[PDB]
Design a protein around this nucleic acid. Structure first.
Ligand SMILES: [Mg+2]
Ligand SMILES: [Mg+2]
Ligand SMILES: [Mg+2]
Ligand SMILES: [Mg+2]
Ligand SMILES: [Mg+2]
Ligand SMILES: [Mg+2]
Ligand SMILES: [Mg+2]
Ligand SMILES: [Mg+2]
Ligand SMILES: [Mg+2]
Ligand SMILES: [Mg+2]
Ligand SMILES: [Mg+2]
Ligand SMILES: [Mg+2]
Ligand SMILES: [Mg+2]
Ligand SMILES: [Mg+2]
Ligand SMILES: [Mg+2]
Ligand SMILES: [Mg+2]
Ligand SMILES: [Mg+2]
Ligand SMILES: [Mg+2]
Ligand SMILES: [Mg+2]
Ligand SMILES: [Mg+2]
Ligand SMILES: [Mg+2]
Ligand SMILES: [Mg+2]
Ligand SMILES: [Mg+2]
Ligand SMILES: [Mg+2]
Ligand SMILES: [Mg+2]
Ligand SMILES: [Mg+2]
Ligand SMILES: [Mg+2]
Ligand SMILES: [Mg+2]
Ligand SMILES: [Mg+2]
Ligand SMILES: [Mg+2]
Ligand SMILES: [Mg+2]
Ligand SMILES: [Mg+2]
Ligand SMILES: [Mg+2]
Ligand SMILES: [Mg+2]
Ligand SMILES: [Mg+2]
Lengths: 87, 79, 85, 204
RNA sequence: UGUACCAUUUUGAAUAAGUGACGACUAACUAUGUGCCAGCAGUCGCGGUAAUACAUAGGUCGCAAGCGUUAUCCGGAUUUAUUGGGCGUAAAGCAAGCGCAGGCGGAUUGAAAAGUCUGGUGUUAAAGGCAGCUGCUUAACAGUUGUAUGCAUUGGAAAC
RNA sequence: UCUGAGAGUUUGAUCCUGGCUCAGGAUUAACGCUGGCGGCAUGCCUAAUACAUGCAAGUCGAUCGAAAGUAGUAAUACUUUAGAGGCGAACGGGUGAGUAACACGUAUCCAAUCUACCUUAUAAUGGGGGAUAACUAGUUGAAAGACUAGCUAAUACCGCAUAAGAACUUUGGUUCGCAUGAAUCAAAGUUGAAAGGACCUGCAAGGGUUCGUUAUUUGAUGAGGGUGCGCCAUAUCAGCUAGUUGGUGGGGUAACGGCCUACCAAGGCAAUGACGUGUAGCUAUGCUGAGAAGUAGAAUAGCCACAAUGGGACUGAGACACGGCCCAUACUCCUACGGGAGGCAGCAGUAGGGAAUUUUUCACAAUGAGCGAAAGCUUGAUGGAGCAAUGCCGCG
């Protein structure tokens, strides 16, 4: 039940997230298992520096993403790669 | 200072405890009957009750396994 | 097959006055944290002489860990070199 | 935030703002340490600490700098490659209001600082309000347009007296700066390098 | 949240400076009053009727939206000295001997490889430290990349 | 490629040993004087003292009966939920009392283990039964409630038919291991399952998608145990230990195990520091130092322990459960005197202690969590806004 999700390491009035493979029951901004890639809401372009290798490994293992994470995988096109690798 | 969820869970687990206690006592009396008058017939009943309890989760499946194994050891030793 | 290997310790039996046991002693030369000089230590581990190994007093014995057979007993005897005493 | 007795401070240290405007004056041509106890004996034999402190005070009053800012800049410069006696001089001279003075659009350094704080100065591709921004040679520091019509613009645009290390392209007030100031352009008011050692001791 | 921010928007220097010190360590001195009294003090020490050390004023010096005093921790302290101290006269050789355990130990050969050196692998969570860069008007700060130490296993070295 | 400053002070004067003091940083800081603003960050170190008050985990009608309301001549349509049921309430949040030891860090062995939802793959989801919530009526009361007799429904519960594969054994083979001992068969015996919902099509019959259920298979995450090493002061603490050490049979535990039991033995640790006393959450790290290292374990993050004190247990994959249950102790409160209610070391806040440390606030808008198909709902976690020169930085 590992879950690829975000994690905040910004400051007041300036968030900054990191996509990371982490367990369901562990708190936000805590201990994780493997790092996927950072993200800035206000990065204009290339907002999600994605990994595309260990992320695919973890979804193949059975990680359940979140709404925002699924969106981030979508614009780059990682959802296509996952679905076609499933097929 | 009290929660409806907690109260409802208590009211449910009372009934669950009653039913599960009945089943466990049935298993106890069956295995005791087997050991009292050892006979290969009663081992089947022990098997059935232990397996049913193990599936339902009332009893730990590993305890059901050990009960089966030790009763079969007793039967094989006696026969 | 591939099997993970247990940890080993080589020692000399110090005493044996019970049923199926042998209190062996293992030495080590851990460095000192501050003055950086080797220091000889002594700890008396215990093992069981289940059979075929005997390993009476004064016998230099190899020892391999195992799942705990009892309280304070987690080691078993193995190959014996320099059989004496 | 600055002293209002620059005459007194210049008379004490002995060094003015390189023009002697606060030493010539219109009265008495006084070049003595201020206060009643100014014309006394015991002139030389200043201790090592005393002369280090005097030189440091002259340096950090020549630009209107707070000592804490001085420690901050020194801690910034100290870690890099090695002997940065050519780098920390650029670091100390790269102040924005200081660059405005050597541009020549203000009568005095602190007046230029006041203009910078009031927002009559622009930057390469942005605007600047704080009079402490560290600059690098190459940024087109173009002056404002609505400040070229203010009743005090004459001496501002009379920048023909300019330092060679600030290039304006006269009559266009572009005011960039390349060819970083040398020790010649940093006159004998403070030309010493053991103030560096004093800040090395008092700042790790 | 009508918030950050922006504009030729009216008015106008208008709405804004304190604290410690001045005999030496430690940058910075004169007068008035008191007269071993009143008081100061981190240390040496000032005050007994000419006080640059006390109280006030003036002047000057160090910092500054902060400045002093207090408490604790580290350094300076080689002042528990592995790095890095000593025991005749300054603190320190037991009154002397026989001495188990421990520490140290003559020369040469062989083996193994427990110490020692070195290669590969796994790991030492993230944040923090150091180096580089980006973004906040620059900074503080945020983010990003690199960056060790130890343990275990396996493969070699054989001088001690 | 690291990399280190000193001075004053014993004497009439000098050299040395030697102690004291100062020049530098830093804090969860407090006090005096004074005081304009902004960007970040921190803010009960003491009484794990006691708490007024208001909020802090619910969700699903697409599981189920009933009830209510709005429309409708009716048949019926829509909305809402007291109750049964499923899932979640063991996460998340706080505090550091206790604990000197496998508590923690590191490296490992689990041939001595568990793991709900999740991932891959593989067989089924057929047919019956008896009840009880809600409701009705009576007794007892101001009400909380409680007791008694009838009425119902299911994905609640209990049988039965059936095992692709499962579990426990028998027969001999395979490959063996590290001593117990594991791994794979071919045949056989015994034992063993459940539940339907939503929607579409189809005159119907039937068919279909999806959610979900039973039995398995693969991983992954998470939990638990054992061991080597590291980890305070004290000898003005020298003996400690009788389930303590070991063996046999059985029981119990997810598992090995004196974990427990009956029998037989006397052993086990200890001057290389047991045991006793005192103190303390441990660590990554913070501050300092040229370095070796000294010191505190702010904020935050990993792990452990606790929930007024002390015990026990149900449900459950997982608790011996902060805002679940039972009992005792202490305290406070309510009463119509029979009986009851309570646990802020959750968010604010009050009293008290102290030199001293803040709103009795707004929003789920983003991130995360739980339920749900969605509508959404809940989220004092979280994000903001107040207060405070508390610290760094910046401007007047
Ligand atoms: Mg044994
Ligand atoms: Mg045994
Ligand atoms: Mg005074
Ligand atoms: Mg005075
Ligand atoms: Mg020292
Ligand atoms: Mg000292
Ligand atoms: Mg000495
Ligand atoms: Mg002597
Ligand atoms: Mg002698
Ligand atoms: Mg003597
Ligand atoms: Mg002798
Ligand atoms: Mg000897
Ligand atoms: Mg790390
Ligand atoms: Mg950073
Ligand atoms: Mg003298
Ligand atoms: Mg507290
Ligand atoms: Mg309801
Ligand atoms: Mg909890
Ligand atoms: Mg928190
Ligand atoms: Mg404590
Ligand atoms: Mg469950
Ligand atoms: Mg029925
Ligand atoms: Mg059912
Ligand atoms: Mg059946
Ligand atoms: Mg030092
Ligand atoms: Mg902490
Ligand atoms: Mg704390
Ligand atoms: Mg309490
Ligand atoms: Mg259970
Ligand atoms: Mg509570
Ligand atoms: Mg609870
Ligand atoms: Mg509170
Ligand atoms: Mg929300
Ligand atoms: Mg402040
Ligand atoms: Mg400032």
């Amino acid at each position: 039940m590992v879950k690829i999700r975000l994690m905040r390491m910004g400051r007041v009035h300036y968030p900054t997230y990191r996509i990371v493979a982490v367990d369901s029951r562990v708190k936000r901004d805590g201990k994780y298992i493997a790092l996927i890639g950072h993200l800035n809401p206000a990065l204009k372009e290339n907002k999600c520096k994605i990994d595309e290798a260990v992320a695919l490994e973890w979804l193949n293992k059975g990680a359940k993403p979140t709404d925002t994470v699924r969106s981030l995988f979508s614009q780059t096109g990682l959802w296509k790669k996952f679905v076609e690798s499933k097929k | 200072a009290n929660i409806k969820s907690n109260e409802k869970r208590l009211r449910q687990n009372i009934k669950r405890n009653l039913n599960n206690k009945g089943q466990k006592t049935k298993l106890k009396t069956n295995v005791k009957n087997f050991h009292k008058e050892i006979n290969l017939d009663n081992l089947g009943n022990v098997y059935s009750q232990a397996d049913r309890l193990a599936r339902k989760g009332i009893i730990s499946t590993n305890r059901a396994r050990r009960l089966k194994s030790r009763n079969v050891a007793v039967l094989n030793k006696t026969q | 097959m591939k099997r993970n290997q247990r940890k080993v310790l080589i020692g000399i039996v110090k005493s044996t006055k019970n049923a199926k046991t042998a209190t062996v002693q293992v030495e080590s030369r851990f460095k000192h944290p501050l003055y950086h000089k080797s220091v000889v230590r002594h700890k008396k581990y215990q093992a069981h002489n289940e059979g075929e190994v005997l390993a009476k007093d004064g016998d230099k014995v190899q020892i391999v860990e195992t799942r705990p057979l009892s309280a304070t007993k987690r080691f078993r005897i193995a190959k014996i070199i320099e059989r004496a005493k | 935030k600055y002293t209002g007795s620059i005459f007194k401070r210049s008379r004490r240290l002995g060094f003015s703002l390189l023009e002697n405007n606060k030493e010539f004056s219109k009265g008495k041509k006084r070049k003595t340490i201020p206060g009643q106890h100014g014309n006394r004996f015991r002139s030389s034999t200043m201790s090592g600490y005393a002369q280090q402190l005097q030189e440091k005070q002259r340096m950090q009053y020549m630009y209107g700098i707070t000592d804490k800012q001085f420690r901050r800049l020194f801690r910034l410069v100290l870690k890099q490659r090695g002997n940065l006696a050519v780098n920390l001089f650029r670091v100390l001279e790269s102040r924005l209001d200081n660059i405005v003075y050597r541009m020549g659009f203000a009568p005095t350094r602190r007046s230029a600082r006041q203009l910078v704080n009031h927002g009559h100065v622009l930057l390469n591709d942005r605007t600047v309000d704080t009079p402490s921004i560290i600059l690098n040679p190459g940024d087109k520091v173009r002056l404002k347009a609505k400040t070229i019509k203010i009743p005090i613009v004459k001496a501002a645009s009379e920048s023909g007296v300019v330092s060679p290390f600030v290039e304006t392209n006269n009559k266009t007030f572009e005011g960039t700066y390349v060819r970083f100031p040398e020790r010649s352009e940093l006159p004998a008011g403070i030309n010493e390098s053991y103030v560096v050692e004093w800040y090395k001791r008092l700042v790790k």
